[PDB]
Structure formats: C-alpha cells, structure tokens
Amino acid sequence: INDLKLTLSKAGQEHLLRFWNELEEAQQVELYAELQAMNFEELNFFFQKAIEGFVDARMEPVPLQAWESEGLFQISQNKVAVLLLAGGQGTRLGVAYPKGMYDVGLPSRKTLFQIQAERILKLQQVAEKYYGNKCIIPWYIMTSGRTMESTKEFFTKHKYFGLKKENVIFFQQGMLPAMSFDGKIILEEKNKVSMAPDGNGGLYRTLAAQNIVEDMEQRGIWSIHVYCVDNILVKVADPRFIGFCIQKGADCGAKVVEKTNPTEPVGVVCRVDGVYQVVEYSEISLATAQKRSSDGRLLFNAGNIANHFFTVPFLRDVVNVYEPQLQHHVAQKKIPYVQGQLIKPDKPNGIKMEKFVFDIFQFAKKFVVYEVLREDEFSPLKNADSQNGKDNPTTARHALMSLHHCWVLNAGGHFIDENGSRLPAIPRLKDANDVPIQCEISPLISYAGEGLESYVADKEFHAPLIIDENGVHEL
Amino acid sequence: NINDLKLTLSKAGQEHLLRFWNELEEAQQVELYAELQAMNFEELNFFFQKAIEMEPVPRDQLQAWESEGLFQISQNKVAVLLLARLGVAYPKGMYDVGLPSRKTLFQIQAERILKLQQVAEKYYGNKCIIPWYIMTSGTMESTKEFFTKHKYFGLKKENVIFFQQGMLPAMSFDGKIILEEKNKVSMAPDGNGGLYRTLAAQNIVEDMEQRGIWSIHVYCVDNILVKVADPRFIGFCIQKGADCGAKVVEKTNPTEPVGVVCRVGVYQVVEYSEISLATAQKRSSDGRLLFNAGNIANHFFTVPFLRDVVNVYEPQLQHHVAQKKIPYVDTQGQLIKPDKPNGIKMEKFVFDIFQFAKKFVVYEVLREDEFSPLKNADSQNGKDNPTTARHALMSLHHCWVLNAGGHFIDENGSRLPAIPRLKDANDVPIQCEISPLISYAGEGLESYVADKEFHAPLIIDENGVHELV
Numbered sequence A: 001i002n003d004l005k006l007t008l009s010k011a012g013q014e015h016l017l018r019f020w021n022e023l024e025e026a027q028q029v030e031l032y033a034e035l036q037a038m039n040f041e042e043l044n045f046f047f048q049k050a051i052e053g054f055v056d057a058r059m060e061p062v063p064l065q066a067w068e069s070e071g072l073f074q075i076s077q078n079k080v081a082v083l084l085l086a087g088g089q090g091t092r093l094g095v096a097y098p099k100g101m102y103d104v105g106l107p108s109r110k111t112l113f114q115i116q117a118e119r120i121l122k123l124q125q126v127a128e129k130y131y132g133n134k135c136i137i138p139w140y141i142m143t144s145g146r147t148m149e150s151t152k153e154f155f156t157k158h159k160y161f162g163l164k165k166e167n168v169i170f171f172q173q174g175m176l177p178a179m180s181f182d183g184k185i186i187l188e189e190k191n192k193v194s195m196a197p198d199g200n201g202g203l204y205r206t207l208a209a210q211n212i213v214e215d216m217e218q219r220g221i222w223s224i225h226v227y228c229v230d231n232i233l234v235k236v237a238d239p240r241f242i243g244f245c246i247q248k249g250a251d252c253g254a255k256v257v258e259k260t261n262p263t264e265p266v267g268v269v270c271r272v273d274g275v276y277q278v279v280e281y282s283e284i285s286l287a288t289a290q291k292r293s294s295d296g297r298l299l300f301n302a303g304n305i306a307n308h309f310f311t312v313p314f315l316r317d318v319v320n321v322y323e324p325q326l327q328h329h330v331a332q333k334k335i336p337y338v339q340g341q342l343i344k345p346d347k348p349n350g351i352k353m354e355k356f357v358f359d360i361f362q363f364a365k366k367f368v369v370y371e372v373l374r375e376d377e378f379s380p381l382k383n384a385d386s387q388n389g390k391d392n393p394t395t396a397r398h399a400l401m402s403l404h405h406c407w408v409l410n411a412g413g414h415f416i417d418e419n420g421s422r423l424p425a426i427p428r429l430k431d432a433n434d435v436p437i438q439c440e441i442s443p444l445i446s447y448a449g450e451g452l453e454s455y456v457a458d459k460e461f462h463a464p465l466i467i468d469e470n471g472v473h474e475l
Numbered sequence B: 001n002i003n004d005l006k007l008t009l010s011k012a013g014q015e016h017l018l019r020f021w022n023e024l025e026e027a028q029q030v031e032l033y034a035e036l037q038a039m040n041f042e043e044l045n046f047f048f049q050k051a052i053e054m055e056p057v058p059r060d061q062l063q064a065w066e067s068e069g070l071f072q073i074s075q076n077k078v079a080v081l082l083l084a085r086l087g088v089a090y091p092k093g094m095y096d097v098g099l100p101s102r103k104t105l106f107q108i109q110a111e112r113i114l115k116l117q118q119v120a121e122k123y124y125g126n127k128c129i130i131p132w133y134i135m136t137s138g139t140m141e142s143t144k145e146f147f148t149k150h151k152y153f154g155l156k157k158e159n160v161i162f163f164q165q166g167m168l169p170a171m172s173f174d175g176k177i178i179l180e181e182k183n184k185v186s187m188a189p190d191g192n193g194g195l196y197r198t199l200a201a202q203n204i205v206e207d208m209e210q211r212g213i214w215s216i217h218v219y220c221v222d223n224i225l226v227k228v229a230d231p232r233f234i235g236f237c238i239q240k241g242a243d244c245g246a247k248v249v250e251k252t253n254p255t256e257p258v259g260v261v262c263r264v265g266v267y268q269v270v271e272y273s274e275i276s277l278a279t280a281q282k283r284s285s286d287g288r289l290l291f292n293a294g295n296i297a298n299h300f301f302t303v304p305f306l307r308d309v310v311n312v313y314e315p316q317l318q319h320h321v322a323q324k325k326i327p328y329v330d331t332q333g334q335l336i337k338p339d340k341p342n343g344i345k346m347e348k349f350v351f352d353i354f355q356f357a358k359k360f361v362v363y364e365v366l367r368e369d370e371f372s373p374l375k376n377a378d379s380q381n382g383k384d385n386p387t388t389a390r391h392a393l394m395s396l397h398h399c400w401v402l403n404a405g406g407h408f409i410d411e412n413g414s415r416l417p418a419i420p421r422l423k424d425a426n427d428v429p430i431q432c433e434i435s436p437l438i439s440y441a442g443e444g445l446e447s448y449v450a451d452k453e454f455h456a457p458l459i460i461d462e463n464g465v466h467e468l469v
C-alpha cells in the first residue's frame, strides 16, 4: 500500500483510503483492485479540461438500386460489420436487464436482439444468393454497466440466434469515477469508488484501449454500421445506407427521420459554425425547436436516429487521433456517498464526465445524411408503458406489426374478418373488441418487405398472421 | 396372462425361459413374469443375429489451453460424465487402493472436481459448478447409498446426477436367453457404449442444455490419476474447435491392453482384443510402434455433438460380442459355474461414436501423470493393480514436491536422490500423498514445500503438512 498511498497523494486523492482500517480484508482487496485499476493523473486532467469547458444563435439547417446493390456487394465481400450500442441496464424501462433482451409482446415473443440477429443472418443469405459465396457481417456489441456476462449467457442460450460465436464480438465499456466540485473522487461506500459509464461516446476510448479497430482491420472490414439497440425497426447493416455512403465516398454518415413535432426528443443534425454535428434535444431553446421554414416544415427537422456509417480508416483516426482532443461534457449528478456515514444527497454533489457517439462528426471530411421513413425505420423503445404514451413497448410492437401488415398488402395479400370481408388498409377501430391487425414476419423471410409473393400474393388471411421459417400461421 | 406370454416367447424361440414355471412359488412367478413382459424378444433376437455374425494417426501452449479450460469451467459450461476382475462385488469407485489417506477413487475424483471449481473461481473471480453425471448400471443403489453417507464428498446433491444404463440378457451361442436362476434372466450392462442410448432415453442431453453445459469430459472410473475435467484437455479441444476428442498415452509395449486410435478414412479406436499380433508389433522407421496412440478412456464431447448423436448417429452403433462364462441354472434345476464359456454378452463401446466426429482431435498426455488403471487384483499378472495404482499416485506427488522446490530426507536428515535405490526387500519407495483440495496437478505447493525438507511418509492436506511417524 505505500506505493498506492504515494500515487494517491501525488494526485490529491488520498482521502480514498480513509476507511481502510474499518474494512475486513475481503473488502480491502476489492478497494485495492479498484484503485490500482485507475489512472489518477489522467483523471485529474480529464476533470480539469471538463471544467474549463463548463448554441441556437450558431445553428443552421441541413439544406437507389445502385445503392442497394453496392451495399449487398460490400456485404458479399466480407467488408461490412455492425457495431451495436447495446447500452446498460434498462432503467428507463423499469428493468435491470439490458434493452436487447426486452420482449415487447410480439406474437413471436422475440427479443430485440433476436430480431437484429435475424436481420444480419438474412443479409448474409441474400448476399450469398446474389453473389454466390458465403459471407459474414461481424457483430461488435458494446455493453455497459456490467451487463456483459448476462448478455453473453443470453446469446449462448439462444445459440447466437443462428450466427457463429466467432463472429459476435462482445466488449464492455469503461467506467469513470464520479468527482466532487473540487475534483475529488467520491467513495460510494467505505470500500467502493462511485463509478459510472462515460456515455456512449465512451465507445472511442474503449475501442482504442481494447484494440477493436485492429480486429476490424484484420478481418478486412471497410464499412461499420453503428446503431442503437432500442429501435425495433432498425435496418441492421442496411444495404441501401451502406451503398449510399460508399458511392458518396463518405467517411461518416448519419440516418435521419423528419422531425415534425417541435418537442420530440431527438438530436437534430445541423451545421454549427459551418461544421456538422448533432445538437442534442435537451440543448435547444423552444424557439429553435419550433422555428418553421417557408414550406411549413420545422427548420431543424433532421432528427438523429442513432444510425451511423464510419469507414474503418475514419474510425481508426477517431480512436487514435481525434476523440482524445475532445473534452468531456460535465453533467451534475446526485451521487450516493459515505465521514463515517452513508448519505443519499437531495441535490447534486458531483460531476459525471461523458461523451456521446456523435461528438466526432466534426472530424469527418465527407459527412453525409440519409433521410428515411419513420414508419419503416424508427420506433424507439425509450419508456415504460403509461409514462407518457410514447416510445414504449406498446408503440414498438404496434409499429412493427403495422409495418408487416403493409408489407403483406404491398405484396398482394389481404386481411379478412371472420366472414371473408376484406379489411381496409386503415381499418376503423370502433368497438372495445376491435384490435389492429396483428402481423409479424421474420427477418429470415423478409428483410424489408421483399420476397413475400409466394407466401401472400392473392390470398386472404385472418389475423393474427405470423410468417416465419416454419411457414404461414393464422393463430 | 401366462398363456399369452408363452406364445410371445414361442414366436421368438425363447419359451425355455418358462422351464421352471411349474416349480416356482407365486411371488417368484410374478417377478419372472414382470421381467419377461418388459423385454422385446423380437428385437433381442435381431440384436443377437447381427452381433454373432487400419491406418496410423498421423502424429508450451499448455498454459494457454489450461486458461481456456478454466474459463469454460468458470462460466458453468463444463460437466463431467463418469463411466461407473478385482475380486469384489462392489463398484470400482468405492475401491480403496491403500493410499495413506485411504480415500476411495470416488472421493479422489470428487475432490478434483471441488478443487477445479475453486481454481476457476480464483482465476476468473466467480463461483462456478462442474456437474457430475454418473452412469451406473443395475451398482446404482449402492453407489447412491455411498455418496449420500459421505455427504457427496462436499459437493452439492443437486449437481451429482446418477443415471442407470440399460441391460441386456446373456445369450447362449445358439441365441437362447440364459436363466441365472429358475426365476431370473441373466442380465448384464450393455457396455460403456450403452451411454448413448441411455442419454437419448432419459433426455440427459436436454438436461445438459438446460444447465448451460457446452463441453462434456467422459472418463473411466478405474484410473487413480484421472484429471477429472482437465482444463488443459478441455482448452485444447476448445481452441482446435473439435466436436470430439480423445486423450492418449504412448503405447510402447505391443501387448499392452489398450485400444488404439487409428483411421479406418475416419477415426476409430480398435480395441486391444481385436488387433492381430502383427499389427500390434509393427514399428515405424523411428522405432516406435506404428499404432502407438493408446486409448485412456478419457473423451471430450461438445453438447451439440451429443445432440447430433442422440438425434442421428446413436441408432447406427453396433454390438460387440464377448464369450463369457455365465453362471446359470441347468435343465435339472442345478446352479452351475461353467467349465467352458457357455454364452455371449453383447456390448457397445463408448469410443464407437468417434467415426461420426467431423473435427476429431487427439491429445497426448504423460502416462506417469495421467494413466494408472486399476484392472487386476494384486497377484494376477503384476500389472494394473492396487499396488501399481497406489505407487503411481505416490510417485507423482513425490515428483510434485521436488518440482515445487522441496526435498525428501532420510532418517538422518540427508537429502535423498530423485530416484533412490531400494536397499533391501523391506525397503519402501517414498510415500507422499497430496490432497486434490491442496493441488490438482502440482500447482499451489510453494507455501507447503518450497525450500523445505521432509521425511516420508509425507501427507499434505487441508490440515497442512504431516510427516507420519
């Protein structure tokens, strides 16, 4: 401990040992492990530059077959990977397990992870169909908190959903200590430093420290599709988006949906002082949020759907060179703490340092924006049911089923009531007993509405209707 | 009831099984009746009619393999499956070879399992479990009794899974089922290859899947040196991506009774009793035996492979036959111990599944560290007996002490050679025994022995180091 004491004294963090004599050896060793693992010199520096750092006026608006084929070709060449921002405990949904494990009550009861996995396997199959060889889209999954072990167990239980273990790469995001307004690391307990994830922009520090870009390079990957786990409609490894970005020579790309409600909680892609960035929804004034352009659309209408494209060379530069130049954002927090007694604070007593995944768009030499349709591509799981009526399991399950219902109609199929009366595209729900059409199509059958003609063309179905690898089921 | 059974028996040419029915007490009749009704005589005849009717294996990372095996164990992804002449009627697991500790083979195995759980916890930081599947035969109740009395040697009841393999009737050379007693069919276990059928029948692979098991280490009960759930073997098999693996030692004596791993363009073991002397003696240009990969009855199976075995491969396994001297009751009602073999037992062999492996690997180990089987009673042929078994274990642990920096001394305090000369017929080899709870394979001995010296017998256990006096 005299080497540790010295390290702590040099950094001005020697209060971290103040309960040492009150701990049993079991507990002392876990503190020791925690402290020995930290870079106190670096942390003081991060704090100092974060505090030094501690918008609307400078914001300005953002003014196909070949794409899909290009994307499928890149997939077929083993040149595409995906990187999943898997998040931490699903505390915003009222659960401790990560969001990828959430079951929104689809007819199949499939989790978000399973749907995403089946989308990946599907594209591998489609590419093999068009270009003739077996191909691989590796799946890099960044977990946070300490959800990694349970995520691995979940995947193993499900046999990686038909993917191969060797092509799913789990890695866990680092944590930073909470700091007081004086820059002192806060003990949560006598034997425990208070620690927290450093935001999804902690991705970059984590890729660097764990040599993840080097694995992509070894595999020969060129394009990375970064996406958020919470969106049930997400077009994982979307070949149209990948082809778009490849043909534009993008180093970085972002998908957006049209924001139509001023107070929708989406970051807006815009230019600030000439450069591309996402301005977070909690940063803009209501005046900026509500500004309309002459067509009547919102001026800032490019809503960030957390779906990005990076080339591997750009990611390498971000990880090795750029992100280290960015200072952390300060967020004040109520941090539970221990002289002698365990206290829960009624007001913020400390700072969490964080970065966001979109903070490095500013470094892109060729940034591009790809607009998509909300109903086909963006239905996020953000909230518990009944919290605010939006972005919850009910809206998520209904968005997917609505989408699949539309696929069936567009492929020439029809839904009928119990008398064989064909239902409208938009049915009237008038009695307490009426429910929307329940339709669920596995990604193994259809990625984006293609390939349904043998299943549904010129046929009538009574919902609920499930289409999957075992056929067509009317429940 | 009886006139119907008789017709069933008559159709199968087995009606002699009722020979003594007119002399049996009522309760005796009920028991024989229940035995016979459960048998499928058509199938048995079919088994009997079929049953009665090579290329060499082309020949450091040890720590990396061990670490991977420990990681599998730490994730609860490893289980072991125990396959369970000495002149005793009780199962071999209960045999006491006369170690200083007097521990039975079962106890030594149990403590190896407990040890690895602890070692994997030390390595990776979480508590973990290695389920122990124990395949018995119709040994089952005695084995369970024994374990319960010893409180599972410190393991949890719920992680020791006893299951009973099938039995087959002994049959004459003419395919007639043999009566052991006037009201009892002579039954024997169907070979250690009976594992696969039993797995399918009792949904054991479902159980492995439910538990989250990925790798099974299958091993023979009789080897006092057996590295139960050996993390090196498991790790090797994991890194090679094998579905199936077999541990071997180098066979150097042509007539050693070990099966030999070979290719027959697929992997097999050819049992020692099926090889010609010519094949057994053949030597390659380096002077080693051409067929030198001796099967030590230690196998690796992935659970997906066992799933494929249960789903697809298990039905194609063949019965081996062996001529046996089967105790019987003659046509005069006399109990006879036959002067000449009088029938056959049909048996499957556990290694016959290797022909279905797509990624089969062989892992060579050192005999002195890993293989000292208990096959024979002490006087019978000078080999593979309680004496050799006990001395092999004590020699190993002696080597562990020296390798860890300790020394043995004589009664005057003088250092003994690694290989001392025996002085007279009353002299003894160094006696040393180290509990598996202290050391699984020679690790963790520094604090006990490094730069210390010991007068044998030396025991090291959870109560420390003991010079016996």
Ligand SMILES: CC(=O)N[C@H]1[C@@H](OP(=O)(O)OP(=O)(O)OC[C@H]2O[C@@H](n3ccc(=O)[nH]c3=O)[C@H](O)[C@@H]2O)O[C@H](CO)[C@H](O)[C@H]1O
Pocket (backbone or CB within 6 Å): A085, A086, A087, A088, A089, A090, A091, A092, A093, A144, A199, A200, A228, A230, A265, A266, A267, A268, A278, A280, A281, A303, A304, A305, A306, A356, A357, A380, A382
């Ligand atoms: C910083 C960020 O990403 N902002 C994006 C976000 O905002 P939004 O503020 O809604 O993001 P969340 O609140 O969904 O995510 C922030 C981070 O919080 C963590 N977390 C969140 C919920 C939870 O139950 N557990 C948990 O650990 C995750 O690490 C996650 O990556 O998604 C939207 C699209 O839907 C926006 O348009 C984006 O600008």
Ligand SMILES: CC(=O)N[C@H]1[C@@H](OP(=O)(O)OP(=O)(O)OC[C@H]2O[C@@H](n3ccc(=O)[nH]c3=O)[C@H](O)[C@@H]2O)O[C@H](CO)[C@H](O)[C@H]1O
Pocket (backbone or CB within 6 Å): B083, B084, B135, B137, B165, B189, B190, B191, B192, B193, B194, B219, B220, B221, B222, B257, B258, B259, B260, B269, B271, B272, B294, B295, B296, B297, B349, B350, B351, B373, B375
């Ligand atoms: C078929 C077999 O494995 N042969 C092996 C065997 O022969 P070996 O002829 O000496 O012995 P066995 O076939 O009896 O097999 C030994 C193991 O199988 C178990 N058992 C046996 C019969 C049964 O119906 N059920 C059952 O579980 C025994 O309890 C024991 O644990 O061990 C040697 C190594 O020492 C050989 O190199 C092997 O080729």
